[PDB]
Design a protein around this ligand. Structure first.
Ligand code: MN
Ligand code: MN
Ligand code: MN
Ligand code: MN
Lengths: 479, 483
């Protein structure tokens, strides 16, 4: 069948990928005791937007649920699925013949059916009539709470929908659960997005020079991903933190727009991931700006490399993800004690939650069409109310087909360090004379993307992540 | 005073630029007979957004009016200006100390006062109290209709605003009019945005190779503008049309995303413009994919170059912009007849609106903080209901300080050509025997940005736009080389 493709060496993504998702959703919905016969899933795609009140067009990126079901790149569409048969109907906007002048060629409905391999194509202005003809019991629309944003999903609406019986509770948890488990076709896309972004990270590491602005590497990374990978979008705003900014978790946004000059002796923490056809990648490389780890930098780096490798080696079906976060905490504390920053019983440090002083974020998260992918906290899965652990984006047990980031880090964040130093329960573990040397160190994060298999994980990321690989890469060495 | 700056070779933009805008707005409002004493301008900045229902953050770009007045890059702010004194107060979000964990240093209000050179800085949640203490007569908020989008500007609102007298009619036309006329400090930025985008266009022309995807040049252009110009944004989505796509005026959107392979013999029409500190640039370069104009390509290009040169030579204060559009139409029709594509009386062709078949868009538009800048159709300036002219984004007379695109073009759009061939009023002018040769030709546009001066225009753009410069550039000649 047909495939999405941007030419050159970019990946061909079969449109069958989305037909399988539609089928998987129907199978799950048929098992749901509350789903009536003759139900129709109704999803609304994203619409074209502009900057505020201007006519400056914003580059359109499809809504993630709609993309998962249909893979449609055009704005203004709807898509419905007959639950009982799996029959898919795409609704495209009716463009007046006069629009050839400005937007391009006016494609027939037949063109879109062939392009997307759906069962039928109708015009958006006919959606009520078309749906009325099928005499559905109820329309299943999308409404739920994204557990990372707190936002409520946009439920489909169209002119005349009030004449139908609409259920907006059943769909969200089912289609979320389908997204948690990636098909082999989806994994192929995630292998590709990791390949391109890994190559881009390698190019950025080769190019970093003392005296450059952080954003020079952001530009380079995105240029590689687009020109070489066909990735017009990034999965998230590039985080190009150097020096003290490598300790700033929320760095690179408009308020801190990657505008610092890289200085000799700085650590760099570059967290960047290209997006291909609305599929994410999420990779972090930390390294010395001048290509040579100091002893202090090497010690901090290898502590995170130890926890990274320990987590990946332990991951397999049945593992509780919060246990992996605790494993990384314990290893960080062991290594920070070895370094002399900490002293005392590591068991006692764990009881005091000292790990979270150095890694306040979650160990990792589901990844997919969204970089922080859906389904981390379905009903019955509770958030853990402890420092560090409460920031985990899922408290689920691992299962095959899940895709997770593994991104332990250690950071020296003055606000957390000072709070711990004022707490007698934690101050005792800290050796100020050594810690002072690491004030302003910044931080180290090592992030990989992995798939849970039947027996362990598959590593998708391929970047230089050992000290030897990093220093060799940055000195212009081959291989 | 302080300056916005992204290091390296990027432009230092004094924050005094925005102080001047605030002062100019206050002077205009003080002259306004309907503005009450003790009035306060209240603008609401843009807020942080995400993709749909996800937590995927969208890179924040400031709202244009708010940027014009204050130059603030942070989301979540408000800004007020006391009309009578000019006193400026920036309101910034109150971040709880616990956000350092993720945010680093949480900047003090003093930091923002020094950063932006405003008279006072307060927290957003105190705006109601702060304004109550100043005992304003009226709050002047922003509401009006953008004449390019049809959208209504977002009026400032905050909890407690109903306790104040609010006027939402006076401000919009005044602040729009202030934006129409660019200050010397603003021109320095628009000169810079044109400089960077011109260099990027040159790099793209040097790098274009038959067999590349259009988007490879889009990526290259944006990479140059950001890495070398500090332009994190483009002024608009890049239009990288090759072959038949050069005839597609709004090409490159998600539905047609610059994904065609450039083939030998194609014309390329690349309309790309970097944005620096929310200031626009807007440039189009047309050129042969293989670096050598054919006779047909050369003829069409020079026809558009003739109309561009004539318009720029004629532009000066007092000139009616629609007259410039008609001038370009007439020159296009004359040259297309000289080519053999058209035959007959050009006077007859003009009366028939034949120009619009070949240039269906407007000749050019105001440019500024927005690429299609505000103020083209203030009250009492009417859109002209004719082909081509109805697409003009202003029907105003030129005055010094205005910034305009000059972007004539000729395109071979089958839809329009066939319409003309089915119209007895127009069909006779077309010579199919020659016209057939130009079906699928694509199109040529030559777009530059200019400033209206006291007596004419200043050229902001510096790209290869003659046939000789273009072939020279694509053959790797240096920018200094004079062909
Ligand atoms: Mn990341
Ligand atoms: Mn991540
Ligand atoms: Mn343009
Ligand atoms: Mn333009």
């Amino acid at each position: 069948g047909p495939s999405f493709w941007l030419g050159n060496e970019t990946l061909k993504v079969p449109l069958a990928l989305f037909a399988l998702n539609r089928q998987r959703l129907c199978e799950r919905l048929r098992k749901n005791p509350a789903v009536q016969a003759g139900s129709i899933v109704v999803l609304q795609g994203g619409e074209e937007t502009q900057r505020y009140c201007t006519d400056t067009g914003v580059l359109f990126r499809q809504e993630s649920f709609f993309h998962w079901a249909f893979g449609v790149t055009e704005p203004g569409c709807y898509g419905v699925i007959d639950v009982d048969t799996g029959k898919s109907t795409l609704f495209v906007p009716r463009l007046p013949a006069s629009h050839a002048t400005w937007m391009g060629k006016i494609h027939s409905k037949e063109h879109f059916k062939e392009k997307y391999a759906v069962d039928d194509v109708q015009y958006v202005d006919e959606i009520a009539s078309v749906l009325t003809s099928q005499k559905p019991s109820v329309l299943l629309t999308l409404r739920g709470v994204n557990t990372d944003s707190g936002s409520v999903c946009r439920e489909a609406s169209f002119d005349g929908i009030s004449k139908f019986e609409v259920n907006n509770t059943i769909l969200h948890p089912e289609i979320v659960e389908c997204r948690v488990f990636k098909t082999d076709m989806e994994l192929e896309v995630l292998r590709y997005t990791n390949k391109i972004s890994s190559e881009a990270h390698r190019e950025v590491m080769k190019a970093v020079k003392v005296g450059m602005k952080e954003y020079e590497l952001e530009s380079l990374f995105e240029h590689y991903c687009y020109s070489r990978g066909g990735m017009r979008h990034s999965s998230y705003t590039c985080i190009c933190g150097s020096g003290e900014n490598s300790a700033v978790l929320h760095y690179g946004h408009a308020g801190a727009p990657n505008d610092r000059t890289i200085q000799n002796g700085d650590m760099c923490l570059f967290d960047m991931g290209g997006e291909y056809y609305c599929f994410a990648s999420d990779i972090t490389c930390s390294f010395p700006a001048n290509g040579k780890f100091t002893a202090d930098q090497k010690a901090v780096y290898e502590a995170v490399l130890r926890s990274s490798r320990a987590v990946m080696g332990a991951m397999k079906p049945g593992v509780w993800w919060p246990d992996m976060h605790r494993l990384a905490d314990r290893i960080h504390l062991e290594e920070l004690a070895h370094m002399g920053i900490l002293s005392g019983s590591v068991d006692a440090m764990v009881q005091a939650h000292l790990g979270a002083v150095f890694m306040p974020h979650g160990l990792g998260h589901f990844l997919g069409i969204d970089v922080h992918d859906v389904g981390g906290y379905p009903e019955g899965v509770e958030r853990i109310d402890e420092p560090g652990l409460r920031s985990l984006r899922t408290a689920r047990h691992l299962q095959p087909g899940m895709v997770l980031t593994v991104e332990p880090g250690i950071y020296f964040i003055d606000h957390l360090l000072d709070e711990a130093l004022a707490d007698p329960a934690r101050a005792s573990f800290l050796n100020r004379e050594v810690l002072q040397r690491f004030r302003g160190f910044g931080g180290v994060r090592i992030e990989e993307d992995v798939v849970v298999t039947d027996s362990g994980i598959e590593l998708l990321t391929c970047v230089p992540h050992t000290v030897e690989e990093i220093e060799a890469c940055m000195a212009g060495c081959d291989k």
